[PDB]
């Protein structure tokens, strides 16, 4: 499923992402935008061979098991395909584990290079959340 800006923000708010670990809702919507383009089915294969899955592009070498990434820790203990679902609960739940990791949202390259230090609040303005 391809979400709308406000549609995804309300879904993330309800799943408890607004200010989870100090990151306001706009950060999460901005990240999703540049990581998957709001598309739950997005997959991207990396040079190291791991693949990124879903709305929040969660990585197979550490967080999920896709049955093809050797040395995968599968920290969120879940098959990567579960993350391409129209229901974002699994993505959001694993993302919470990733963000509490000590590196924060810097773990997402797109957040770091395109959202960090911007008016992220512009991402949820005009939304009935």
Swiss-Prot record:
Its main location: secreted. It catalyses: Hydrolysis of (1->4)-beta-linkages between N-acetylmuramic acid and N-acetyl-D-glucosamine residues in a peptidoglycan and between N-acetyl-D-glucosamine residues in chitodextrins. CDD domains: LYZ_C. One of its GO terms (molecular function) is lysozyme activity. In the egg white and polymorphonuclear leukocytes. One of its GO terms (cellular component) is cytoplasm. It is found in: Secreted. InterPro entries: Glyco_hydro_22, Glyco_hydro_22_CS, Glyco_hydro_22_lys, Lysozyme-like_dom_sf. Keywords: Allergen, Antimicrobial, Bacteriolytic enzyme, Disulfide bond, Glycosidase, Hydrolase, Secreted, Signal. The active site is at residues 35, 52. Lysozymes have primarily a bacteriolytic function; those in tissues and body fluids are associated with the monocyte-macrophage system and enhance the activity of immunoagents. Has bacteriolytic activity against M.luteus. Monomer. This is Lysozyme C. It comes from Gallus gallus (Chicken).
């Amino acid at each position: 499923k391809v979400f709308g800006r406000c549609e995804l923000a309300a879904a993330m708010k309800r799943h408890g992402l607004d200010n989870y670990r100090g990151y306001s809702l706009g950060n999460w919507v901005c990240a999703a935008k540049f990581e998957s383009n709001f598309n739950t089915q997005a997959t991207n294969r990396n040079t190291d061979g791991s693949t990124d899955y879903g709305i929040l592009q969660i990585n197979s070498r550490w967080w999920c098991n896709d049955g093809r990434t050797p040395g995968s820790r599968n920290l969120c203990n879940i098959p990567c395909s579960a993350l391409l679902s129209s229901d974002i609960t699994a993505s959001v739940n694993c993302a919470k584990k990733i963000v509490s990791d000590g590196n924060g949202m810097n773990a997402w390259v797109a957040w770091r290079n395109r959202c960090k230090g911007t008016d992220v609040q512009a991402w949820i303005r005009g939304c009935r959340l």
